[PDB]
């Protein structure tokens, strides 16, 4: 079963870990990652709120916007952290730790 991680491009940065497990990445987050997550969730909730003031469901639209926001933000943060764990992104503090 082709369950191997190799990329057509190459990890131009150091290669601290090739295929990190889930919990490792999601606990490897950085302050910038949480900021990205919070920003996405916030903008989503606000646009949901207004687009809900239009038809009178300010609440439920806020909840749905929140769901989409958490989904997108966590996916973006996990993507950034995974990149920094592999080499496809700048690694300074990850290399510091793994040293």
């Amino acid at each position: 079963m082709n369950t191997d991680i190799t990329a057509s491009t190459k990890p131009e940065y150091p290669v601290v870990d090739r295929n990190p497990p889930f919990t490792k990445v999601v606990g490897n987050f950085s302050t910038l990652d949480y900021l990205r997550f919070v920003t996405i969730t916030g903008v989503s909730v606000t646009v949901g709120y207004l687009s809900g003031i239009k038809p009178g469901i300010r609440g439920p639209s806020m909840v749905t916007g929140g769901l989409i926001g958490v989904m997108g933000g966590f996916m973006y943060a996990y993507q950034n952290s995974a990149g920094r764990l592999m080499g496809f992104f700048p690694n300074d503090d990850e290399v510091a730790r793994h040293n």
Binding site: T31, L32, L35, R36, V38, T39, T41, G42, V43, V45, T46, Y49, R58, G59, M62
Partner: peptide, 30 residues
């Protein structure tokens, strides 16, 4: 008579100020 009495709007305003603060912090980490 010294408060806002609309729950949904207050949640939305919390979300908006959180959004702006997060964007400012993100920029600070450029």
């Amino acid at each position: 008579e010294r408060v806002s009495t609309d729950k949904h709007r207050n949640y939305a305003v919390v979300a908006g100020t959180i959004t702006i603060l997060g964007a400012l912090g993100w920029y600070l980490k450029g």
